[PDB]
Design a protein around this ligand. Sequence first.
Ligand SMILES: NC(=O)c1ccc[n+]([C@@H]2O[C@H](COP(=O)([O-])OP(=O)(O)OC[C@H]3O[C@@H](n4cnc5c(N)ncnc54)[C@H](O)[C@@H]3O)[C@@H](O)[C@H]2O)c1
Ligand SMILES: NC(=O)c1ccc[n+]([C@@H]2O[C@H](COP(=O)([O-])OP(=O)(O)OC[C@H]3O[C@@H](n4cnc5c(N)ncnc54)[C@H](O)[C@@H]3O)[C@@H](O)[C@H]2O)c1
Ligand SMILES: CC(=O)N[C@H]1[C@@H](OP(=O)(O)OP(=O)(O)OC[C@H]2O[C@@H](n3ccc(=O)[nH]c3=O)[C@H](O)[C@@H]2O)O[C@H](CO)[C@@H](O)[C@@H]1O
Ligand SMILES: CC(=O)N[C@H]1[C@@H](OP(=O)(O)OP(=O)(O)OC[C@H]2O[C@@H](n3ccc(=O)[nH]c3=O)[C@H](O)[C@@H]2O)O[C@H](CO)[C@@H](O)[C@@H]1O
Ligand code: NA
Ligand code: NA
Ligand code: NA
Ligand code: NA
Lengths: 338, 339
Amino acid sequence: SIEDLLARKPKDLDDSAVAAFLKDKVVLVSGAGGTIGSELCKQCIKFGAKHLIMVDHSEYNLYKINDDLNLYKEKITPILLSILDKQSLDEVLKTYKPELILHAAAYKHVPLCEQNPHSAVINNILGTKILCDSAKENKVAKFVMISTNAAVRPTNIMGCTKRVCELYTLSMSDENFEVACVRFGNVLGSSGSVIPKFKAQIANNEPLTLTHPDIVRYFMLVAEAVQLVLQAGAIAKGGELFVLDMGKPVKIIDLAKKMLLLSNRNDLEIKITGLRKGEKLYEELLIDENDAKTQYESIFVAKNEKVDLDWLNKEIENLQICEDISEALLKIVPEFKH
Amino acid sequence: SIEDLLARKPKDLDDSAVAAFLKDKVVLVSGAGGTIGSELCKQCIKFGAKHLIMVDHSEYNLYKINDDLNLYKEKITPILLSILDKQSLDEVLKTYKPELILHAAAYKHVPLCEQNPHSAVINNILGTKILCDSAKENKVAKFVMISTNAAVRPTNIMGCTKRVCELYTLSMSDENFEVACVRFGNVLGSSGSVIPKFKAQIANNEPLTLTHPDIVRYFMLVAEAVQLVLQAGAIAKGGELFVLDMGKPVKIIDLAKKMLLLSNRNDLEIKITGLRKGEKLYEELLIDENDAKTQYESIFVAKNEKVDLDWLNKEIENLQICEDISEALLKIVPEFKHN
Ligand SMILES: NC(=O)c1ccc[n+]([C@@H]2O[C@H](COP(=O)([O-])OP(=O)(O)OC[C@H]3O[C@@H](n4cnc5c(N)ncnc54)[C@H](O)[C@@H]3O)[C@@H](O)[C@H]2O)c1
Ligand SMILES: NC(=O)c1ccc[n+]([C@@H]2O[C@H](COP(=O)([O-])OP(=O)(O)OC[C@H]3O[C@@H](n4cnc5c(N)ncnc54)[C@H](O)[C@@H]3O)[C@@H](O)[C@H]2O)c1
Ligand SMILES: CC(=O)N[C@H]1[C@@H](OP(=O)(O)OP(=O)(O)OC[C@H]2O[C@@H](n3ccc(=O)[nH]c3=O)[C@H](O)[C@@H]2O)O[C@H](CO)[C@@H](O)[C@@H]1O
Ligand SMILES: CC(=O)N[C@H]1[C@@H](OP(=O)(O)OP(=O)(O)OC[C@H]2O[C@@H](n3ccc(=O)[nH]c3=O)[C@H](O)[C@@H]2O)O[C@H](CO)[C@@H](O)[C@@H]1O
Ligand code: NA
Ligand code: NA
Ligand code: NA
Ligand code: NA
C-alpha cells in the first residue's frame, strides 16, 4: 500500500498515556464523522472513554461513524448538529457535561475556502468561537483544537481562519479551562485529498493531474496523527500550541509514480495542471530550532502569545459583516500573505 | 447488481421535455452533493442548463460533485453554504439570479431525526422556509421541493418535518412563484441506506441485520426519480403536489437473500433485529385511485389544500421554542401518529 509506504511509523506512540488521559471520561468530538473526527472517536473508545458525544452537521458522516461503532453503541450518542447553533450546543453540553472536547469540525479545503471565504470564516472562526465559549461556560476541563501547519504564515483563507482559531482558543485558556492546539500536516488518504483523487483517475483510466512537478508535502497516517494529538492533549497544562514532527517531505510526483507502479499502470500519463490558488509549493519549516521538546520525540511546543480577547471579539464581529475578508483577516494575522 | 434487478425503468422518460424546461436556465440545486442532488446536477448539465449553482453544507459532498463535473466546470459554481444562513443565501441568489431552484437539502434518516428532533425541525422546516422565502423575494420563477412518501400519514419526526415543508412551500406558490413538491420512495443505493449497509456487512463477514421479516419498500433508481422530478417540474403550473409511481414493493428479506445469492455468501445468517422507532412496515398506498393523472404515466397529482401562512409561520416559531416537538408537530399535521 501507498499509505503503508509513506506511513510515519513513529517510535513514540504511547497507548498507556492515552488510556490514562481518557479513562472513564465523557468526551465530545466535533466533526465526529470526518476523517480525523472518526479516528478520534474510534481511539476514544479503544482507550477507554466512558461516553462519547459525537457532534457532526453531516448526516451521512454521523450515520457512518455511529454505524462503525455499533459494537459500542451503549457508550456513544450521535448528535446531529452544527456547532453554529449555540443554543442547541449549550443544551448538549449542559446535558452531557463532557470533561474533554476534541474539536475537529472545520472547512479544510484550500480551493473551496478561497471560493467561499465568508462561509470559511463563519464555519471555522465563528464555529470555533461558539464551541469554545460554550465549553468554557460549561466547565469543560480540557479543549483540544485540531489545527494545521497551514496556519503558519498563511497564504490562503482556510489557513488563515485556522490561525485565528488558534489565537482565539489559546487566549481563552486558563487554570480551569485548559486549551491545547495541535498543528500537523497532510493526513494520508483523507476525505477529498490527493490519494483518493489519483486512485479514482487510475480506476477511470484518466491521466493523473499533478499541480506542479516540484511540489512536496509532509504526510502521516490518520491513526498516527490522532494518537499523537491525544498524547499532546494528555500532557497539556493549558495554553500550548503543539506541533507534530512528520519526517521528510514527499514529492507529489513520486507519490503519483508509486501509485501507478503499485497498480501495474504505467500506461497512464502524469499531466501538469498548475498550482491551485492559495497553495504553497513547499509548505513551511515544520519545527523551529527553538520549539520546546516534550517527552515525545514526535511532539514539540511552538511559541504563542495570548491576544486581547476584547480586541479579538471586535475583529470577529467585523469579520461577519465586512466587505473584504482577506484584508480583514490581515489585520488579525499580520503575517497573512494572500 | 441488486440495483439492476429492482430498477423501475419507466416507459415515459422524456428527455426532450426536460431539455426544453432546462434550456439556458440558471438553476440552483440545494443539497447539490447528496445522492439526489448530485444526480440533479448531472442531469441539469446533461439537459442544457446554462449555469448550475451547487449549494451544500458538506464540504466533501460539494468537493465531490464539483470534481465529478470537472469536464463542465465553466458551467458550475460550488457554493459552500448552509441554507440556514439567510443573509448569505440571499446574496447568492442576488448574484446568480437563478430561475429554478431544486431543493434537495434535508436530513432524511428516520433514526437520527428521532434522536435529534430539534435539528430535524431546524434543518428541514426552517431551512426550507429560509430558502423558499429567499427564492420568492428574489423572484425565482419556479421552486421544486424534493419530498418523500414518508410525508403521508407520517409516523416519524423526519417524515412529519417533510410534510410541514410541503405545507409551507405550496402555500407560498402563486402566479409569479410556482412551487411543485414531488413525493417518491426509496432511492436504490442512496447514502446511508440499506443496500450499502448490507454490502458492508457482507464484505465484513457479518450477519445481515433485517429489521422485520415482513417489511417492504418501494424502490427506484436515482436517475429515474430525478428525471421524473424534472418532468414534473416541467409540466407544473404552480401548487402541484406530485407523486411518482414506483411499481411493486420489495420485501427487504428478499433483497437480503438476493444480495447473499449474488455475492455467493449464503453461508451468512440473516438476523432479525427489530423495527426501528418511527418505522412503518408497508409504507402507504402510493397512488390514491382518485389522484389526478398527468401526461406521464409515472407521475400523478395528489390532493392538497393551502393552509394560512399567517397560521403556519406562527406554528413554525412555536416549533423552535416548544417543550415537546412531537406534540407541536401534531398541531400542524393532525394525521401524525408518532411511534
Ligand atoms: N485531512 C488533513 O490532511 C488535515 C491535515 C491537518 C489538519 N487537518 C484539520 O483537521 C480538521 C478535520 O479535517 P478532516 O480531514 O477530518 O476533514 P473532514 O471534512 O473529513 O471532517 C470534518 C468534519 O467536520 C464536520 N463539520 C464541519 N463543519 C461543521 C459544523 N459547523 N458543525 C458540525 N460539524 C461540522 C464535517 O461534516 C466533517 O464530518 C480540520 O481543520 C482540518 O483542517 C486536516
Ligand atoms: N434517498 C432516498 O431514499 C429518498 C427518498 C425520497 C425522498 N428523499 C429526499 O431526497 C432528499 C435528499 O436525500 P438524499 O438521499 O440525496 O440525502 P443526502 O443526505 O445524500 O443529500 C442531502 C444533501 O443536502 C445537504 N444538506 C443538508 N442540510 C443542508 C443545509 N442546511 N444546507 C445545505 N446543504 C444541506 C447534505 O450535505 C447532502 O449533501 C431529501 O430531501 C430527502 O428528504 C430521499
Ligand atoms: C485534506 C485536504 O483536502 N486538505 C488538507 C491538506 O491540504 P493539501 O491542499 O496539501 O491537500 P491535497 O490532498 O488536496 O493535496 C496534496 C498535494 O497534492 C497536490 N495535488 C492535489 C490534487 C491534485 O489533483 N493534484 C495534485 O497534485 C496538491 O497541490 C498538494 O501538493 O493538508 C493540509 C495539511 O498540510 C491541510 O491544511 C488541509 O486541510
Ligand atoms: C437513509 C435513507 O435514504 N432514508 C430514506 C429511505 O428510508 P428507509 O428508512 O426506508 O431507508 P433505509 O435504506 O434505511 O431502509 C430500507 C429498509 O431496509 C430496512 N433495513 C434498514 C437497515 C438495516 O440495517 N436493516 C434493515 O432491514 C428498513 O427497516 C427499511 O425497511 O426512504 C424513504 C422513502 O421511502 C425516505 O423518506 C428516507 O429519507
Ligand atoms: Na473509515
Ligand atoms: Na448509542
Ligand atoms: Na456518485
Ligand atoms: Na466552476
